Amino acid sequence: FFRNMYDKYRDAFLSHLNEYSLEEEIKEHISKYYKLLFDYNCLGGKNNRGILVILIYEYVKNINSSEWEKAACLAWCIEILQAAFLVADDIMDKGEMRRNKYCWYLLKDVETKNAVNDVLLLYNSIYKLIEIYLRNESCYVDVIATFRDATLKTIIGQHLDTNIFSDKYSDEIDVNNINVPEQPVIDINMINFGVYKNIVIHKTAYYSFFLPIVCGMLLAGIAVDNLIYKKIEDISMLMGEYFQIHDDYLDIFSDIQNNKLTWPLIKTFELCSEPDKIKIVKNYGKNNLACVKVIDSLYEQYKRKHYESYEKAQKAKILSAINELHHEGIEYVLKYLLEILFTG
Amino acid sequence: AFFRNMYDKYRDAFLSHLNEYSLEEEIKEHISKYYKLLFDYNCLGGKNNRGILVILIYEYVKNRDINSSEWEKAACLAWCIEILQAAFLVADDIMDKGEMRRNKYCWYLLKDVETKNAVNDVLLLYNSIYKLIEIYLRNESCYVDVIATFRDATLKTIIGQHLDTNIFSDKYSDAHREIDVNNINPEQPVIDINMINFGVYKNIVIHKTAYYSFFLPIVCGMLLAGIDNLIYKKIEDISMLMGEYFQIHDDYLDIFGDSTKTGKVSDIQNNKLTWPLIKTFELCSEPDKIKIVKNYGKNNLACVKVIDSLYEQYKIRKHYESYEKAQKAKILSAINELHHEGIEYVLKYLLEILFTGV
Ligand SMILES: CC(C)=CCC/C(C)=C/CC/C(C)=C/CC/C(C)=C/COP(=O)(O)OP(=O)(O)O
Ligand SMILES: CC(C)=CCC/C(C)=C/CC/C(C)=C/CCC(C)=CCOP(=O)(O)OP(=O)(O)O
Ligand code: NA
């Protein structure tokens, strides 16, 4: 039913913009543009984060029409957040396709300049929507703080993912250099699971798991002083890692060319001979067909099988963390979520 | 000067927050190094008209005693509006492909930064505002109203930007064809003559400038002081007038001002709907209209000269001078109809000091 309510939240926000002191013709142009911005970018994903909110809310509470209206609001707000992350991420990473269609920023009628502005519109629409539907709820402030704090962590994780190999992170920033572009290179001191977990937990775990779970519980009426919140934070960290490692696995089976610190990169570096370390450093992070293939060949050489081995062990560690919650409703949801992560 | 001395307190309060994240120590020192510069490079160097408006309004709203922790909350909101400006300027320079801002390279041009970091940094700077308001105004009754004011003014600015970016675009000229989500090719941008009018210009400029630059600071000062009241609507209207006044001057500077004085080099080549363009178009001959259509929006210097010579031919400088006097009087007349002495003093002082600062 979550998908049925999309139009309401979209139209609610667009109705706010329509109240502006603007000429009727100009209002028409913007409702056209912004309806598409939402539709193109909020619709078409697996909706795991949105569904997670709704499932957690239902399995803590055990629900009328207004209650679901607030739950579905927060669910779509996180999908709107994902949309904003998606648009921004594709600008930054100069992406080609997202969800089997052209990245928003690539479109002739959009371009990078609009996509930047649109990320901030999508991002700010979130808080207008929460205001519209949850202004008079007692959890109102805690909910917006949860979005804010999870977003800040995501920004920092995104920063680390972008810059972990950059010449600035190897051992001051030059405010006079606008002319000499730094060549993308690997930094071997950063190729380790400790650094990787830092990035992954901040970039993924907080907005993807912590935020949706907390929204559900917050709206349900679980007081923020409750000890479960810290347990859920710890579980969310484990799941975020699990999800991103799998995301890294799917990419190879544009991270190689984009010089990304991936789990496949770290595992390979851990497993490979010294000559192959030189081979990785020479061939990684380059937009060259021959270079990517060499990196592709090494992943095949050092066996795909190591991911499967990790996936089984991490899943077990999560189910153990889930079981110490001592909350049946959330436990089932988290066990169900864990099963349906990759499919949606 | 008091406002300026408080800068580090608020910067370091946010930097400490990031420093609390569960990260390895080496990572944490890289983060703090990057983000200290992000703030320093982009928050310092302006006229600080928006920050000072907060400070002045907070004080002159009512003649009263104000303790140092009370001033700490005001200087926070004052600096939050300067962070917002810093986020706006970084974003604007990305979108417009800027060269200089406040007499130095645009943040995004730095080879250590690039567009990819700058986009991420806009969102960090923007989000730091709300973390700061939380840290310092968490337990204030006006807290929800303050962040909602930031939120709503930002939304309007985003809409103003959208229009400034897209007013002459294909989508606006061809309102009948839907956006082709399969077209990843744009053809040379041109002006749309139906859009060259002052009614459209005010729509754009009020939203892009007036709400964040005037309404937001004044409302911040008032809400925190403890004032809902009918004066807010009257203050919304003056803000409209001052924003329009401010942006027209800003259009004047673009073509007629020294880049070593203003700190920045664009409107003609960026195909912008400007006051000098609208003023030229209602005043010039038909052959000159075609000349404008032919030459406006082009990066070639021979094309911008043609436009620049037309501004000289039609003496746009004197037309602005005439506007400036007319509008300044129009604003003072609305300010005098507020029936509030303290805010009147501030708005009068601000109107005198807009273009120089302090
Ligand atoms: C929501 C965010 C952060 C944004 C994305 C994109 C948006 C809406 C944009 C920013 C566009 C904007 C309003 C502009 C820039 C205006 C600017 C930097 C200029 C001039 O103001 P002055 O007051 O003259 O400059 P100082 O602050 O240096 O005195
Ligand atoms: C604060 C904002 C909006 C922006 C600035 C830039 C930031 C922090 C970025 C975004 C980085 C990010 C979290 C990434 C992209 C991850 C992504 C879009 C996801 C994949 O998630 P799935 O759930 O597999 O995709 P679906 O939603 O299509 O199912
Ligand atoms: Na999702």
Q: How many domains does chain A have?
A: 1
* Interrupted after residues, chain A (C–N over 2.5 Å): 62, 171, 253, 303
Residue recorded with tokens 């207008």:
A128
Taking Cα atoms as reference points, which of A117, A89, A115 lies closest to residue B88? A117
Taking CA atoms, A111 is separated from A26, A41, B94, B97, in Å, by: 20, 15, 12, 13
Which residues lie across from A101 on neighbouring strands?
A98
Q: Amino acid letter at B289?
A: K
Encoding tokens for residue A47?
Answer: 């909706």
Please tell me which of the candidates A21, A145, A175 has its beta carbon nearest to residue B105: A175
Residue A284 φ then ψ, to 5° = -80, 150
Chain centre distance of CA A132: 25
CA distance A81 to A123: 6
Minimal C-alpha gap between B325 and chain A (Å): 26
Q: Resolution in angstroms for this experimental structure?
A: 2.3
Range of the domain at B240: 1-358
Whether A247 has a binding-site annotation, put simply, is yes
DSSP assignment of B184-228: ---------TTT-SHHHHHHHHIIIIIIIIIIHHHHHHHHHHT--
* Contact yes or no for B186 and A111 at CB 8 A: yes
Contact A33, B162 (CB under 8 A): yes
Encoding tokens for residue A323?
Answer: 């079981």
Pairing of strands B104-105, B100-101: antiparallel
CA dihedral sign, ordered B66, B68, B73, B77: positive
CA dihedral A251, A257, A263, A269 (to 10 degrees): 140
Which residues lie across from B101 on neighbouring strands?
B104
Work out the angle between the directed axes of helices B301-313 and B316-335 (0-180°, nearest 10): 70
By C-alpha distance, the chain A residue nearest B96 is: A113
CA dihedral sign, ordered A32, A35, A41, A45: negative
Q: What is the largest CA-CA distance in chain B?
A: 68
Whether A142 has a binding-site annotation, put simply, is no
By the CB criterion, residues less than 5 angstroms from ion ligand 3 are: A 48-49, 82
Minimal C-alpha gap between A300 and chain B (Å): 32
**How many other CB atoms are found less than 10 A from the CB of residue A169?**
18
Please tell me which of the candidates B163, B175, B182 has its beta carbon nearest to residue A28: B175
* B357 dihedral zone (left: phi>0; alpha: psi -120 to 50; beta): left
DSSP state of A260: -
Residue recorded with tokens 């602005």:
B320
Minimal C-alpha gap between A92 and chain B (Å): 4
DSSP assignment of B250-319: HHHHHHHS-HHHHS---TTTTT---HHHHHHHTTS-HHHHHHHHHHTT--SHHHHHHHHHHHHHTTHHHH
- CATH number of B226's domain: 1.10.600.10
Contact B28, B37 (CB under 8 A): no
CA distance B80 to B91: 16
CA distance B317 to A303: 72
Please tell me which of the candidates A23, A108, A145 has its beta carbon nearest to residue B184: A108
DSSP state of A221: T
Q: Closest-lying ligand to the alpha carbon of A83?
A: 2
Q: Amino acid letter at B51?
A: G
Contact B78, B51 (CB under 8 A): yes
Work out the angle between the directed axes of helices A228-252 and A305-323 (0-180°, nearest 10): 170
CA distance A41 to B331: 43
Taking CA atoms, B323 is separated from A45, B120, B240, B317, in Å, by: 52, 40, 16, 10
Q: Closest-lying ligand to the alpha carbon of B129?
A: 1
